[PDB]
Amino acid sequence: PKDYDELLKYYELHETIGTGGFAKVKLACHILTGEMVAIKIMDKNTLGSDLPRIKTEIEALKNLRHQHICQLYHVLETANKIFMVLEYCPGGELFDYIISQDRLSEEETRVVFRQIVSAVAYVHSQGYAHRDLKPENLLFDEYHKLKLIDFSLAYAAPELIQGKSYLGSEADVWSMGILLYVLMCGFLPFDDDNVMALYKKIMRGKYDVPKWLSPSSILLLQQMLQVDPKKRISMKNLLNHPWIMQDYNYPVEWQSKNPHLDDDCVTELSVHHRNNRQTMEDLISLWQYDHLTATYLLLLAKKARGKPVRLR
Ligand SMILES: CCNC(=O)C#Cc1ccc2c(c1)NC(=O)/C2=C(\Nc1ccc(CN(C)C)cc1)c1ccccc1
């Protein structure tokens, strides 16, 4: 209805995949590269008074450039809509994975968990928090690598639950502790059939420790699942934790391996736009999160996954 016209120059829309909170999520294809993307759609009239909060939050997400975070490619604002185009993760949720395998071994949990820690550390290093860590918000890519999305009650920290002020970073550590327990046990540490009983169990902080957990596992859970947020392990101490280090002998590399422009991607854009190299480089370097940014980031992802850097 005219809000979709600009978008439909660049993307072919596939199926809705998520009628989430404030935003519809559609699957789509970027025409020029033929790459699948996820498109978050919001209506500006129903955001109303929140429209500035969101526009500002969108600017924070532009800086989230990290191998274990789903990347933002394109922001398009029309008269009535905001469209956000995001990195597609075909592998589905970690939630699905844990159900299929029942529970992960300590060794496999460790591989999974270092990736989460990696991304969460990066987020906190930029002065942000995720605030909603759970297996539904962690996706696998085609190489079985984890990507964080969506910047529930079972994973929420005691202070958050009481409606007190809370530090995002501290709440993220509690939530990762619940994630850790779920990965290794195959079930929640705190569960109940009504909200009040659940809230109470979370506040009391007592949970069962299954007899298959290693002493090292038990200890790391005890450092993360501390009802008093002050008593919780710091990010610093988590990246170099003994359990984290087991079978690896180096700490979690959390800093972004993502950049300087990639010469193959620039070449292919210069060819397509019939430009000099230096002209394309200047234009890409504006980083407007327009169609050019989108195409560039999608070629950079074809490269990163070994594919050829080509436009149609
Ligand atoms: C900038 C920081 N990042 C963000 O804020 C973000 C994000 C975000 C959110 C969601 C997705 C994403 C990125 N990429 C994706 O591929 C997403 C979805 N993929 C997805 C859906 C269905 C199947 C199942 N198929 C078989 C239909 C697979 C895959 C997805 C959509 C809705 C719910 C769960 C996942």
Short mmCIF file of N, CA and C in Angstrom, two decimals, residues 152-155 187-204 206:
data_model
loop_
_atom_site.label_atom_id
_atom_site.label_comp_id
_atom_site.label_asym_id
_atom_site.label_seq_id
_atom_site.Cartn_x
_atom_site.Cartn_y
_atom_site.Cartn_z
N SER A 152 10.38 -16.98 29.02
CA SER A 152 11.24 -15.84 29.34
C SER A 152 11.43 -15.64 30.86
N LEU A 153 10.31 -15.77 31.59
CA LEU A 153 10.29 -15.59 33.04
C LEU A 153 11.28 -16.53 33.73
N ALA A 154 11.37 -17.75 33.22
CA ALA A 154 12.28 -18.77 33.75
C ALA A 154 13.78 -18.35 33.79
N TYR A 155 14.17 -17.43 32.90
CA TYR A 155 15.56 -16.99 32.68
C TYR A 155 15.85 -15.63 33.30
N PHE A 187 16.66 -29.48 31.32
CA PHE A 187 15.47 -28.92 31.99
C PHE A 187 15.82 -27.63 32.81
N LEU A 188 14.79 -26.86 33.15
CA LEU A 188 14.95 -25.63 33.90
C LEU A 188 15.35 -25.88 35.33
N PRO A 189 16.18 -25.00 35.88
CA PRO A 189 16.44 -25.11 37.32
C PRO A 189 15.26 -24.67 38.20
N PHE A 190 14.47 -23.72 37.72
CA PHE A 190 13.33 -23.17 38.47
C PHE A 190 12.12 -23.29 37.55
N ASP A 191 11.11 -24.02 38.00
CA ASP A 191 9.87 -24.17 37.25
C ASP A 191 8.72 -24.27 38.22
N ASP A 192 7.55 -23.83 37.78
CA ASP A 192 6.32 -23.99 38.57
C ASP A 192 5.10 -23.72 37.68
N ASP A 193 3.91 -23.97 38.20
CA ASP A 193 2.70 -23.87 37.33
C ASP A 193 1.94 -22.55 37.46
N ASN A 194 2.53 -21.59 38.16
CA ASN A 194 1.95 -20.27 38.23
C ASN A 194 3.07 -19.25 38.56
N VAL A 195 2.84 -18.01 38.17
CA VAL A 195 3.88 -16.98 38.23
C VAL A 195 4.38 -16.70 39.64
N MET A 196 3.48 -16.63 40.60
CA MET A 196 3.88 -16.34 41.98
C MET A 196 4.79 -17.42 42.57
N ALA A 197 4.42 -18.68 42.40
CA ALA A 197 5.26 -19.79 42.85
C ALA A 197 6.63 -19.81 42.14
N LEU A 198 6.65 -19.53 40.86
CA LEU A 198 7.91 -19.45 40.11
C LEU A 198 8.82 -18.32 40.61
N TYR A 199 8.24 -17.13 40.76
CA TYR A 199 8.94 -15.94 41.28
C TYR A 199 9.55 -16.24 42.62
N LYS A 200 8.77 -16.85 43.50
CA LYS A 200 9.30 -17.22 44.78
C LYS A 200 10.46 -18.18 44.70
N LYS A 201 10.39 -19.16 43.79
CA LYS A 201 11.46 -20.18 43.70
C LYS A 201 12.76 -19.53 43.20
N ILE A 202 12.64 -18.68 42.19
CA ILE A 202 13.75 -17.90 41.66
C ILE A 202 14.43 -17.03 42.75
N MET A 203 13.61 -16.35 43.58
CA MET A 203 14.08 -15.47 44.67
C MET A 203 14.82 -16.24 45.74
N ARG A 204 14.35 -17.44 46.06
CA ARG A 204 15.02 -18.30 47.03
C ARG A 204 16.31 -18.91 46.48
N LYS A 206 17.23 -21.83 45.31
CA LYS A 206 17.60 -23.25 45.48
C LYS A 206 17.14 -24.07 44.27
#
